[model samples]
Target: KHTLPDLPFDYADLEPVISHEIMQLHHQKHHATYVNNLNQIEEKLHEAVSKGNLKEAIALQPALKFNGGGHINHSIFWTNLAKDGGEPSKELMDTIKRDFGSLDNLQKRLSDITIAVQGSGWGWLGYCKKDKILKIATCANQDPLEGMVPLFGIDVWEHAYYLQYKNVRPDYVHAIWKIANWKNISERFANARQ
Candidate 1:
């Protein structure tokens, strides 16, 4: 059975940008639900498969995708932060400049698309393996990044920031840049390319 991973930082550490209470609930309640649900869904799926229940097994796809994606996305989401923003590795910065003109441009472009999400999705900075380029993308409702590898993601789901930024998703999005864990993203980028 799957379990929620412990947060890398203290709940209060992300404060001002993310409140301690919000972190507690998001990790303990929301994320834990995803983990617990995913475990149950997988167990049921195994039974269905073992019993040759094709219809029932196929029916579990949506729940599996949703809960599995939630677990994957939130796992990366927690590592994508620092108390204060960390420096991007030289290789990562060079790649961003090459792809999006400059770091500033990458930030603006990603933020624009992220804030434009209709509702309850994630805004991601993903690496398109086929093109060997970094791209800005959004996944609706815990979809996770498909085709491309998610290097960095800023959760656009209201539950992620509503407690601190209220209804203004942009405020939450912008503030996250302040604690963006570029080091982790850079490493993911390196592995993605390999």
Candidate 2:
């Protein structure tokens, strides 16, 4: 059974950029619903498998993907934010420069791609272990990131910023950088290389 993970900081910690009401509801209500649904889906999936009901097992894949990816994405998203944002490590900066020209360019590219997402989705700065390079990617709905190690992700779901930013998604996307947890992201980058 999957459990709802607690926020690393208080609901109000990410103020100005993200309001207390939004964060509280996003985590306690939205994320909790995903966790609860995921648990139920897993239980039903197990039963279908046990009964050799292949069709039923197959039918549960969408729910499994959605709820499971929601869980995975939010878990990372929480730690990817900090009130005191830090700079990237030397190694991570080197890679960022090599891959995206400069850190500023990387930020613009990520923000651009994230903002362009047509609907609910996520934009990610993920590391490709196979290519040994950093890449920007997006996933629609609750699809989990694939083919890379997700270092940092920005949630573009309306629930993430509609309350504060209103219809201006770019503002919310750009503002998120203020609280970007470079320490946690750099750690993920280092681990991905290993």
Candidate 3:
């Protein structure tokens, strides 16, 4: 059985943007279901791999990664938004400036990348150890970010917006930023890069 995530704030806390009803259904049903499905797939994956069953292993990879990342990413996303609202650390603030020239630039770049994503996917701001500069990446539909460290993320999947915003993804993307927890994002950058 999967457990419902404890939203740090009440569902209505994200209200006027994300409704209380959306939060209730999304956390209680959607995300919980994904977590449960992911666990089942994980166990089944272990068995298949242990048995040296390559066929099943290959086929299951997509769902395993998709649902697993869904659970992981969405869990973080809720916490990454706060009611009080705030700013990232000075260190990360400086880093973001260095990486993308300006805060508006970073959001602009992410928005462009998000708009360009074909089908369902996510846009991420990450720390690239090799380059020693933060980077932006967009991975197609539940495919985890590869070859970089994920520091911040924005999910643009239909399940993320269909009910509320309908087809206007740009509005939803822009809106969520108001609630973004730069503090949490800064910490993720520090931990991932350090």
Candidate 4:
């Protein structure tokens, strides 16, 4: 069964950028629910498959996709943040500059696209293994990014910021950059390239 990953920092560590209240709810409540539901759904799916109940198995897919994705996304999301996040690695910067012109440009582009999402979703900086390039993408709801390797992701879900940022999703999106775990992201990029 899937389990919720422990947060790297204390709940309040991300304070000001993300309130402790929001962090607790987002991790302890929201993400935990997804893990719980995903485990239940997997059990049912296994039973249905064993019993040759294709219809029930098919019906369970949507739930699996949602909860499973929630687990995967949030696990990475936790490590993608830190109180004292430092600058991007030299290798990562070269790619960012080559692909998006500059780090600032990349941030603005990613922020603008992420802020424009129709509803609940995520903004990601993913690496294309085939093209060896970085790209900005969004995933609706709990859908995970496909084809590319997810290097860094920003949760745009209302639950991620509504409590503090209110109706201003753009503020939350932009503010998140301040806490971005560039070290972790650069490592992910390096591994993906290999």
Query: What's the TM-score of each model vs. the native?
Result: 0.97, 0.98, 0.91, 0.98
- What are the root-mean-square deviations of the candidates from the true structure over C-alphas? 0.9, 0.7, 1.8, 0.7
Per-residue alpha-carbon lDDT of candidate 3 for residues 5-61, written as tens digits (9 for 90 to 100): 798898889867676777788788888888999989988998999999999999999
For model 2, how does the per-residue alpha-carbon lDDT over 14-72 read when each residue is reduced to its tens digit? 99889999999999999999999999999999999999999999999999999999999
lDDT score at residue 99, model 3, on the 0-100 scale: 83
Tell me how candidate 4 scores on lDDT: 0.95
Residue pairs with clashing backbones, model 4 = none
Off by over 4 Å in 2: none
Please give the lDDT score at residue 19 for candidate 2: 95
- What candidate 4 gets wrong by more than 4 Å, as runs, is none
Please report, in order, the local distance difference test score of every candidate based on alpha carbons.
Answer: 0.92, 0.95, 0.83, 0.95
Give the C-alpha lDDT of model 3.
0.83
Which portions of model 3 miss their true places by more than 4 Å?
A: 1-4
Residue 148 lDDT, candidate 2, scale 0-100: 100
Error of 4 at 169 (Å): 0.7
Sort by lDDT, best first. Answer: 2, 4, 1, 3
Displacement of residue 20 (Cα, Å) in model 2 is 0.6
